[PDB]
Nucleic acid binder design. Structure first.
Ligand code: ZN
Lengths: 141, 59, 49, 76, 112, 177, 94
RNA sequence: UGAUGGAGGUAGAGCACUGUUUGGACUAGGGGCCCAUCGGGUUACCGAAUUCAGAUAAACUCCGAAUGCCAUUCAUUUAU
RNA sequence: GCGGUCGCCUCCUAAAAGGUAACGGAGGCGCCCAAAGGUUCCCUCAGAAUGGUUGGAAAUCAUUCGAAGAGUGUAAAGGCA
RNA sequence: UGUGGUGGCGAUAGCGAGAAGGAUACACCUGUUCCCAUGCCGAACACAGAAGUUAAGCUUCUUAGCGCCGAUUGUAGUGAAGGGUUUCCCUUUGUGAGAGUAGGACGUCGCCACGC
């Protein structure tokens, strides 16, 4: 039961969301990064798998930027328990991601090893992804 | 000076071995030693003889 | 502790009013200059014994 | 086997007379709990922070500068 | 030490009073002078006033000035047909040269 | 007394011309002498408030306050409203009399003179003192004194800087280092 | 330097999605002279001035009257597309 | 249905607060030894004293809305 | 059936009037105060920095900054400088 | 015309940074016997007086650092109408969000008294 990330809690049970659109602020702290062209939850353990499959192909690392973090709690009942009584115990920590804003960032590594790391990262997330630069600003150094 | 709740103070003239700090008030009062016109015309009993004259922040 | 209590006209003897007291703070029979209807006159009032 | 399912009852607040009415004497205008609207002209405050119309007139709402709002009644 | 200035608290007391054809009075201090006005709202009009020491008051630096002022206010006001006034306390108490205004205002026409 | 005349004869115009002011209104003065008595032992004994108040009545012709708590913390065994300390303010001519009782009488009864620590200005020019004993005065009997109690003086001025306060209170005594 | 000026109209309701599929840039300009004139562009009009003469240099929005100088400020660029929206100008002098 | 006036926090970008939060600078100063039996505690964690950017809500938000609702000696059509 | 619940008050579900379910999601009640009521005057808080014997980071002081970061008998909302 | 008192208008009135002033007025300032007051203290509070000073307050002038007020299109939503996937997405019509700036902005209107 390897748990990468948690919270400080303040409420056990929570509601269940509605994904309809999600937005805010593309790549800042890096050079190369993903997107997420669909809508899903993303659990704890998928970010374990992403960290490992990123940093193994990063010899001596570089700079990897984790950007979206679990906040919300699962609940679930047992197997064989009827419908009826109150919400089952909270077991898990998930957060939602929708519509092409960015899960990870890379810097400190040339172009082909970066696309290695992102291609070998995105087979462990249930979302269709892309690969994004810093494009053009008033200044991108 | 709210009434009836305050102790004594009168110009108790001071003396010493020397230098005569004949100016101030006091608390412990009593027998007439120098009721003097150039000072307060009161009872000078505080004449205890530590000088405030000789310790070497003075001379 | 506390008591539902009644107050008495000390002149014409009618159980006029009703109030409360905490019987470990006020261990005695109260006295309040309350109005009285039968005399139309402000009257001392005491606890019924 | 839960510890919930208990509640209060809906005590039915809100504005009970619009602007521009012709309002008789002593009828309720906006039942509060906690002062959200202060009274202006001819309006009294009851025990539970309600509002009245002391004069048979016309309710029109206003503001107190920036923060909070007023009600006043103007006769004919 | 910031010695706090003294019109500010007087105006605080003014405004906590004033939140609480029958016009006002006004009562003032300085180191040396005491003024008065008779104002309506929301006309914003003084109908009469009186100086402290300017026209014909002084002849002794006591509160005796203030009794003369409180005479002059009601004397000028009664010619204008006003007997319905309301005292401002200002921002003050009633001990010094303020009851000297008030009792002079009561016994010269202004009804209370 | 002494020092009003000693201000306007020696202390004042020197400090006018040492800093070259436009008027004597910009001169620095001294307003209060704040006097604590931190007992801190009414938690132990309520009879501790006997001695300090009597000694302050011996020092100044007053009776001080009795400060309350404003906290209820068991780390010192305190509830709110518990009696802790006292306060004495001097104004008028008991300013200058007590200052001269400091300078010219009492303070040489501190053995082993290492002066007054000159880093005591509250930043912006007001002195502080923490005094360790109380037998410094001729107003004090021996057998009345039974502890190692002391005083706390905060001399409060009107000055902005620090060396103005230095030159003032050096001109008014204050055996520094 | 001399971009192609197409001065628009006042109310674009749901007509606007026709211009997003045609690759069109409706261009705000609020600045010194103009308070608001939204202006058509083709999306391949700007990139060959940004990557040719400079990413923030002088661009002239003139219809041969007075000479205007702009300072292209911001844009939202929506996800999964990488194409151009929300093009504000800023007309600052010499 | 048209016109006018108003009551009120739903759709969230939003470092106004309440909790949850990821990087950078910085130090107020401390990590078993300080390096030492007066000068650099040091490589490093550095928050609050600070601050540069980024996340986020159902019981977090100065402020909206789509006429939904209540009102008008108002207007047009209809018949309740 | 065994367990849990049965009256009242706050908050969210509640779809920007009012109103509304579930063995939905969180907390309280079955009192207290002779002043903690009425009136008339007067007053402005929490923290932080600098100094000050015992004094401990943090007993009581003094100065500066401080729109509220406090208090409001009792739970939570709405209010109150 | 300058000063003082006294009001309406959402801080566009404010906070900060700076210069000048004393004719009247205001303020600082000198005390406390008198009415009064300090849970100690003429510090305030109440009253006596006018030697002195524009240092502070106050009052006029300058400033866009902080705060405030902000328009148009530019876009999540969304009234209606519709279409395929239906967890959701899209096209006509009817209205739009603050965010982000262009800009405004170091006040306006009223009454009395004194002084020139
Ligand atoms: Zn009777």
């Amino acid at each position: 039961m390897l748990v990468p990330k948690r919270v400080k809690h303040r409420r056990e049970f929570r509601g269940k969301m509605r994904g309809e659109a999600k937005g805010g602020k593309e790549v800042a702290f890096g050079e190369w990064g993903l997107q997420a062209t669909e809508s899903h939850w993303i659990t704890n353990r998928q970010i374990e798998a992403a960290r490992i499959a990123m940093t193994r192909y990063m010899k001596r690392g570089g700079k990897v930027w984790i950007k979206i973090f679990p906040h919300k709690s699962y609940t679930s009942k047992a197997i064989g328990v009827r419908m009826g009584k109150g919400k089952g115990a909270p077991e898990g920590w998930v957060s939602p991601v929708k519509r092409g804003k960015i899960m990870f960032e890379i810097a400190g590594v040339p172009e082909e090893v970066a696309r290695e790391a992102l291609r070998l990262a995105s087979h462990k997330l249930p979302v269709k992804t892309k690969i994004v630069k810093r494009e053009e600003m008033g200044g991108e150094s | 000076m709210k009434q009836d709740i305050h102790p004594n103070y009168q110009p108790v003239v001071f003396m010493d071995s020397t230098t005569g700090f004949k100016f101030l008030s006091g608390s412990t009062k009593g027998s007439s030693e120098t009721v003097e016109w150039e000072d307060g015309n009161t009872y000078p009993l505080l004449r205890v003889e530590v000088t405030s004259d000789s310790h070497p922040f003075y001379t | 502790m506390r008591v539902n209590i009644t107050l008495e006209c000390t002149s014409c003897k009618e159980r006029n009013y009703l109030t409360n007291k905490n019987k470990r703070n006020n261990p005695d029979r109260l006295e309040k200059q309350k109005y009285c209807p039968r005399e139309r006159k402000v009257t001392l009032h005491r606890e019924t014994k | 086997s839960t510890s919930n399912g208990r509640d209060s009852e809906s005590k039915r607040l809100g504005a009970k007379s619009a602007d521009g009415q012709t309002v008789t004497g002593g009828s309720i205008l906006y039942r509060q709990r906690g002062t959200k609207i202060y009274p202006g002209v001819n309006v009294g405050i009851g025990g539970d922070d309600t509002l009245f119309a002391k004069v048979d007139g016309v309710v029109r709402f206003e503001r107190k500068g920036r923060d909070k709002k007023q009600v006043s009644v103007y006769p004919v | 030490i910031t010695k706090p200035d003294k019109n500010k608290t007087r105006q605080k007391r003014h405004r906590r009073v004033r939140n609480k054809e029958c016009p006002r009075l006004n009562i003032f201090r300085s180191n040396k002078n005491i003024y008065a006005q008779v104002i309506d709202d929301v006309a914003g009009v003084t109908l009469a006033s009186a100086s402290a020491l300017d026209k014909e008051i002084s002849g002794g630096t006591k509160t005796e000035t203030a009794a003369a002022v409180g005479k002059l206010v009601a004397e000028r006001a009664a010619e204008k047909g006003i007997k319905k006034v309301v005292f401002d306390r200002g921002g003050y108490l009633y001990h010094g040269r303020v009851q000297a205004l008030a009792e002079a205002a009561r016994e010269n026409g202004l009804e209370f | 007394n002494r020092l009003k005349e000693k201000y306007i004869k020696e202390v004042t115009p020197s400090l006018v011309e040492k800093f070259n002011y436009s008027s004597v209104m910009q001169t620095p003065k001294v307003d209060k002498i704040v006097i604590n008595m931190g007992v801190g032992d009414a938690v132990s004994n309520a009879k501790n408030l006997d001695k300090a108040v009597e000694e302050l009545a011996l020092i100044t012709g007053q009776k001080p306050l009795i400060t309350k708590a404003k906290k209820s913390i068991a780390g010192f065994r305190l509830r709110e409203g518990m009696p802790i300390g006292a306060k004495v303010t001097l104004r008028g001519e008991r300013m200058y009399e007590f200052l001269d009782k400091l300078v010219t009488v009492s303070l040489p009864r501190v053995r082993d003179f290492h002066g007054v620590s000159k880093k005591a200005f509250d930043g912006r020019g007001n002195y502080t003192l923490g005094i360790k004993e109380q037998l410094i005065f001729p107003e004090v009997d021996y057998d009345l004194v039974d502890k190692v109690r002391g005083m706390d003086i905060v001399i409060v001025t009107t000055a902005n800087t620090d060396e103005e306060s230095r030159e003032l209170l050096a001109q008014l005594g204050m055996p520094f280092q | 330097v001399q971009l192609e000026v197409k001065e628009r109209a006042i109310r674009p309701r749901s007509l606007r999605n026709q211009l997003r599929h045609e690759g069109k840039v409706p261009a705000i300009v609020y600045g010194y002279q103009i308070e608001s004139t939204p202006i058509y562009f083709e999306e391949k009009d700007l990139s060959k001035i940004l990557r040719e003469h400079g990413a923030n240099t002088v661009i002239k929005m003139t219809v041969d009257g007075k000479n205007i100088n702009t300072l292209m400020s911001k844009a939202q660029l929506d996800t999964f597309t990488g194409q151009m929206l929300h093009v504000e100008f800023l007309s600052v002098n010499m």
